[PDB]
A paper describes a structure:
Recently, the [name] (YAF9, ENL, [name], TAF14, SAS5) domains were identified as “readers” of lysine acylation, including acetylation and crotonylation. Unlike the bromodomains with end-closed binding cavities, the [name] domain adopts an end-open aromatic “sandwich” cage to recognize histone lysine acylation. The [name]/ENL [name] domains recognize acylated histones to recruit the super elongation complex and, in turn, DOT1L on active chromatin.
Herein, we identified four small-molecule hits against the [name] [name] domain using NMR fragment-based screening. The benzyl moiety of hit 2 interacted with H56 through π-π stacking. The amide nitrogen and ether oxygen of hit 2 participated in the formation of hydrogen bonds with the side-chain hydroxyl of S58, while the carbonyl group of hit 2 formed a hydrogen bond with the backbone amide of Y78. The structure of [name] [name] in complex with hit 2 indicated the feasibility to improve ligand potency. Furthermore, superimposition of the crystal structures of [name] [name] in complex with hit 2 or H3K9cr peptide suggested that the chlorine group of hit 2 may be substituted. As the crystal structure also revealed that the methoxyl group of hit 2 pointed toward the unoccupied groove surrounded by residues F28, P60, and E75, we substituted the methyl group with a benzyl or phenyl group (compounds 10 and 11). The binding affinity of hit 2 was then determined by best fitting the dose-dependent CSPs of these residues at 0.07 ± 0.01 mM (fitting error was used henceforth unless specifically annotated).
Numbering used by the authors: 5 to 138
Write the structure that this text describes.
Amino acid sequence: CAVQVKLELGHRAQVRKKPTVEGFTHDWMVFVRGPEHSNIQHFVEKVVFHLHESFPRPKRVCKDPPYKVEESGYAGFILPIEVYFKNKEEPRKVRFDYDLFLHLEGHPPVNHLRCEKLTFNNPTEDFRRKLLKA
Ligand SMILES: COCC(=O)Nc1ccc(Cl)c(N)c1
């Protein structure tokens, strides 16, 4: 008995009124969430955000919602996002590569949304019940 769930991936990016001491020009926030009124905490063990190596401690872990990272920077990069599941079966996790892009000054702030579908063809009964609670 197969079950399908959706994950929304996205980010906001805004030019700062004043750069940081480091010269960071943008504030940004990247997130993973379920579609509105769905709680993916039922089946999500954790979300791991792999920032660019220039950031201190680039492996940002969110064990609880909201699964998000608020940061400042000066450039965009590829941000691998691992979503770990509350199970002990294949798959234990899924990985996406998120394009964390920033817009130049004068353009409206970035408000970007992606949707990814997760198909689980034969999950265990406990995992299926978690997926169906979201
Ligand atoms: C210290 O972090 C601030 C920052 O934005 N670092 C950063 C981000 C993306 C790229 Cl591609 C590079 N080279 C550096």
